Amino acid sequence: IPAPSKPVIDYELKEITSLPDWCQEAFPSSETTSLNPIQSKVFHAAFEGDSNMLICAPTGSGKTNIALLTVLKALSH
Amino acid sequence: SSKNEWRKSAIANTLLYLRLKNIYVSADDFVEEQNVYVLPKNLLKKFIEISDVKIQVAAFIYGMSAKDHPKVKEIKTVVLVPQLGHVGSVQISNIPDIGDLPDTEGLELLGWIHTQTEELKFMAASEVATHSKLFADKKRDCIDISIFSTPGSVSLSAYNLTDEGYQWGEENKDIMNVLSEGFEPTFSTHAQLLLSDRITGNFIIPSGNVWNYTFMGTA
Amino acid sequence: IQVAHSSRLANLIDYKLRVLTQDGRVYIGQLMAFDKHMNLVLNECIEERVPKIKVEKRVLGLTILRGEQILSTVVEDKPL
Amino acid sequence: LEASTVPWGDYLQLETPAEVGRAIRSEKYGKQVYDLLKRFPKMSVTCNAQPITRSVMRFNIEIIADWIWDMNVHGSLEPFLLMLEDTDGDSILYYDVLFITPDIVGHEFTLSFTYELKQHNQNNLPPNFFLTLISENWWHSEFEIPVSFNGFKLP
Amino acid sequence: SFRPCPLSQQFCGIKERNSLKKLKAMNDACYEKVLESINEGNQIIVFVHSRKETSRTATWLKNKFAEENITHKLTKNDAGSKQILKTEAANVLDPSLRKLIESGIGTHHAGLTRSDRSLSEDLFADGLLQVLVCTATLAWGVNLPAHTVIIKGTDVYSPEKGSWEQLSPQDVLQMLGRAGRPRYDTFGEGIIITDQSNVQYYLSVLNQQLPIESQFVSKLVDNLNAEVVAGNIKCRNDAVNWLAYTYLYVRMLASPMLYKVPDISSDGQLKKFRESLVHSALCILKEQELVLYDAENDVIEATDLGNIASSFYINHASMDVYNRELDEHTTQIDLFRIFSMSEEFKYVSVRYEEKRELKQLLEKAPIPIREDIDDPLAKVNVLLQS
Amino acid sequence: KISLIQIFRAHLWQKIHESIVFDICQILDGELDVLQIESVTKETVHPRKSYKMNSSAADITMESVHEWEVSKPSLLHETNDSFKGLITNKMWFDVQLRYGDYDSHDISRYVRAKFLDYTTDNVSMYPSPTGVMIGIDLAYNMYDAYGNWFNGLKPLIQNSMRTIMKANPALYVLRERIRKGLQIYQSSVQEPF
RNA sequence: CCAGACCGUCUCCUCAUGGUCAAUCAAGACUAUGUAGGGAAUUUUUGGA
């Protein structure tokens, strides 16, 4: 079976400099300086709404990062 | 097979509570003329539990005469002692010095108790000799409780001893199978023993808490 | 610079240590011995001067240092 | 210690450090051993029972603690699980976990409790129950004593 | 499609039936795959069913490549590499797996030393190990991806059933997850060596079709007991309410007929089914003296046993076992047996490579054994003693 | 020679010997207390001990509960014994295999000889001086035992021998092998099932 | 799993405390106890910046 399809781009790859002052050390080794395809939709959501959330995503694709973001958001209050 | 024999015995030892579901004795005629012993169902059970299927385990037993009948002997205190046991025989220490402890307001030396696996109507050479050694010039009229034990039921064979046995014991300690033969049934007069649940009793043990010196040969 | 999470003076014995004195002359040397006053016997003493800008050098001693005028001992690089 | 074939409590009993050293087959470290033996739990326990009425039975326990404390080895406190059990050691009558703190170790510390009896037991009563203090951490502490019932006639 | 390294799925599809030929065929296939890979500079993982299988597989691999070409796996000149190998070969690598390591096609499994296992893990990470034969530990635990991932076989043995089941979708997916490295490489090679008949089933699974179906039926009772202990289920209504929030309820709502449900018309929002479930729970619990319960009156309260269970996270079955097997006259020998019987050791089993050691033990064991070497309980007891 | 090799492949002789020993031990276990037996110790012998025909040693040593009053050296089959000769706490046994052959196929005599020798010879590391030499003849399937005896032992031994020859699995294996070599068979039924 | 907040999870040096050794006619190295002290004002850690 061939390699699965590459994702359709209807979004902005969210960068690290868009964050506040303290959150800029969430990505200390900012290699890309732009989040992966998955987090670009989840980033705003993570920041905006204090609601119950669910990420059905591939294995090894920014789960940790997402968690970190969530933690940061929590700490913000 | 020094390694197989012990392990198996140990394994068996789980099924020792089962040997007091059925308990019976050849009911001797009850006679007030001589002193009669009243043993309890718990102490005996405990003893059985402690004991081995093959090897002879044997403690001292103590108590005193109650005020209902001075002729009746109530076994209150079992006294478990230092001992090295074999199959059909056992090496035992001196008469216990137990004045120091409380609840011993003149508890008299009633005698001793032991296990075995051969249904006799008399005391064997390894037993009689031991008895003699224990009570040579100390107490002539003390009794013995030989408990026959086998899977299913135990049996309480109580015995007494005359003045002739002591002498024999004194002369004929180690070996002596022909002299035993000569002695034979005489003299082991069937003393009077009862088993009750209307009284109960307790255990004295050594300070080390290691009464059985089977594998502690040096100590 | 490599130096681990070391606990005490006993666990850091036989290491190349920078040593600093009261007036401001910087040293380097392998710490041989211990004492009550930290009279630390240096294996090879290269003393350095800074005038009252830039650091100089010397090489006279392989010394028994005295405790009174020492400020604080810094590790440079492990041996072997 | 393992190889000498001796009851453990004997060592505890021994008083002099020299003596201790002698008894270990090693004159060196004897003092250390002695120091650590006083740093092992040792309870000079006593207990006087007494009947309140026919059914209920009070038990005045006197629990002394002879050992010397150490925050490293012992820890925060010393839990000692008290079991009142029958003459045989067949069934438990009453139990309680007690915490020996650093403040207790040495004082004449009393402990009181009550126990209702069975019917048969009430009718005809035993020679003595067994009160048993055992350490949840320390090995071979397991101090057990005879709670006397000699001529204890109920009202 | 949003994955960093896209997963190239692949099936072998074995036609053979008899196990002696079939196995051989599988091995051949694996070899072929490996050959295809290693020529491209591909670091590769080969999953298997069992622990004992792995070593044998490795051995087989070693005997196959040496005939054709030893050179392609050890290609480098090895002045420093050799030294490195020497350093990290003969330190504490006990299981006769050191040879495999030396060869350069090693293995990691539950039953390899903590140090040894760590070394194995890092002998890939440092950048040396070509082939890696593996049990299903690595997929569950460790993040370390490895370009090519082959899954050898379908039939895993689960002590749950006591029978050789197919590879469960949830595990397979996990296994597939580790593949081409998201950081370094571009894409991933995912292969399943399997029986052709079950491929049709596997394909669907691979497409992520079989959903998260609830297995709360087994773990319900214990949970309920715990809740009771905590002190908020006072009636069956309360229990039902509690269950409402759980995923099982949701699952039932979605598709009831398979999960023991009678009908949708009478129940509606499982206002009977839930009750029934509760009742079922509370009979068994009652029997194990874990909670108090009456059928008509309906009043709940937590017992001491229940509390104990809650505290120590003891399974209900285990608790039940404890209840009967512990007795007034139970002795030192029996305690060990009882412990062994604990249901948390139902998945434990004696093995052949364990056996010599066991034999050695059970002669000189202090606490005796009523059971014997072939029984797992006995083994457990001896382990405890050790 | 070839035939013999075929028969006795996979260390057959040794296996047989050990099997016999095991059987004996089992028998002893089954009746320990009846013969006043404390422990029946299996010697951890050198693999060779069975096919050493120069030396010997004990296989199954034996320990008394109390004391055994053993008889004079004598044959396994004998009604007339007296247990008032010598005493011991420790006894032993020796299972001796030998491939008999027409001249030297008398087993009893052989047993008598070897017992007489290996007692007196210093190299045979027997623990005690009183024991028995049970001698099996593989090549004729004849046992006989020679040595000392305590009351109730001899009959038991005889019984064991009777059972052993019927049952012992290594001996049965040997027999089977022999049959194969020869292509003797037992009839069963001639027509095909 | 089980003890934890009313509570000192952990010490660099000298002396004493008792047990040892290595020893010469009355003196040193080692485990351990904190029950001792550390402005013995000057040879150091409590004042020549």
Curated annotation (Swiss-Prot), chain B:
Residue ranges annotated for the MPN domain, each copy included = 36-165
Tell me the compartments it is located in. Nucleus
Describe its function. Functions as a scaffold that mediates the ordered assembly of spliceosomal proteins and snRNAs. Required for association of BRR2 with the spliceosomal U5 snRNP, and the subsequent assembly of the U4/U6-U5 tri-snRNP complex. Functions as a scaffold that positions spliceosomal U2, U5 and U6 snRNAs at splice sites on pre-mRNA substrates, so that splicing can occur. Interacts with both the 5' and the 3' splice site, as well as the branch region. Has a role in branch site-3' splice site selection. Associates with the branch site-3' splice 3'-exon region. Also has a role in cell cycle.
Q: What does the subunit comment say?
A: Component of the U4/U6-U5 tri-snRNP complex composed of the U4, U6 and U5 snRNAs and at least PRP3, PRP4, PRP6, PRP8, PRP18, PRP31, PRP38, SNU13, SNU23, SNU66, SNU114, SPP381, SMB1, SMD1, SMD2, SMD3, SMX2, SMX3, LSM2, LSM3, LSM4, LSM5, LSM6, LSM7, LSM8, BRR2 and DIB1.
The record's note on its domains: The MPN (JAB/Mov34) domain has structural similarity with deubiquitinating enzymes, but lacks the residues that would bind the catalytic metal ion. Contains a region with structural similarity to reverse transcriptase, presenting the classical thumb, fingers and palm architecture, but lacks enzyme activity, since the essential metal-binding residues are not conserved.
Fill in the misc note.
Answer: Present with 468 molecules/cell in log phase SD medium.
What protein name applies here? Answer: Pre-mRNA-splicing factor 8
Origin species, per record, is: Saccharomyces cerevisiae (strain ATCC 204508 / S288c)
The gene name reads PRP8
Q: Which residues of the full protein are shown?
A: 2147 to 2365 of 2413
Curated annotation (Swiss-Prot), chain C:
**Identification of the protein by name:** Small nuclear ribonucleoprotein-associated protein B
Q: Name its cellular compartments.
A: Nucleus; Cytoplasm
Q: Where is the Sm domain?
A: 4-79
Q: Which organism is it from?
A: Saccharomyces cerevisiae (strain ATCC 204508 / S288c)
Query: Per UniProt, what is the name of the gene that codes for the protein in this document?
Result: SMB1
The family note in this entry says: Belongs to the snRNP SmB/SmN family.
Listed under subunit, the entry gives: Component of the Sm core complex, present in spliceosomal snRNP U1, U2, U4/U6 and U5. The core complex contains SMB1, SMD1, SMD2, SMD3, SME1, SMX3 and SMX2 (Sm proteins B, D1, D2, D3, E, F and G, respectively), and is probably a heptameric ring structure. SMB1 specifically interacts with SMD3.
- Which residues pair up as cystines? none
* Role summary: Plays a role in pre-mRNA splicing as a core component of the spliceosomal U1, U2, U4 and U5 small nuclear ribonucleoproteins (snRNPs), the building blocks of the spliceosome.
Q: What is known of its domains?
A: C-terminal extension may function as a nuclear localization signal (NLS).
In its miscellaneous comment, the UniProt entry states: Present with 861 molecules/cell in log phase SD medium.
UniProtKB/Swiss-Prot annotation, chain D:
Query: Please, which domain of life does this record's source organism belong to?
Result: Eukaryota
Q: Where in the cell is it found?
A: Nucleus
- State the family named in the UniProt similarity comment for this chain: Belongs to the helicase family. SKI2 subfamily.
What is said about the domains? Contains two helicase domains. The N-terminal helicase domain has catalytic activity by itself, contrary to the C-terminal helicase domain that may have a regulatory role and enhance the activity of the first helicase domain.
Quote additional remarks.
Present with 1440 molecules/cell in log phase SD medium.
Complexes and interactors: Component of the U4/U6-U5 tri-snRNP complex composed of the U4, U6 and U5 snRNAs and at least PRP3, PRP4, PRP6, PRP8, PRP18, PRP31, PRP38, SNU13, SNU23, SNU66, SNU114, SPP381, SMB1, SMD1, SMD2, SMD3, SMX2, SMX3, LSM2, LSM3, LSM4, LSM5, LSM6, LSM7, LSM8, BRR2 and DIB1. Interaction with PRP8 is important for recruitment to the U4/U6-U5 tri-snRNP complex.
Q: What does this protein do?
A: RNA helicase that plays an essential role in pre-mRNA splicing as component of the U5 snRNP and U4/U6-U5 tri-snRNP complexes. Involved in spliceosome assembly, activation and disassembly. Mediates changes in the dynamic network of RNA-RNA interactions in the spliceosome. Catalyzes the ATP-dependent unwinding of U4/U6 RNA duplices, an essential step in the assembly of a catalytically active spliceosome.
List the protein's name. Answer: Pre-mRNA-splicing helicase BRR2
What organism is this sequence from? Saccharomyces cerevisiae (strain ATCC 204508 / S288c)
What gene name is given for the protein in this entry?
BRR2
Q: Which residues of the full protein are shown?
A: 1160 to 1314 of 2163
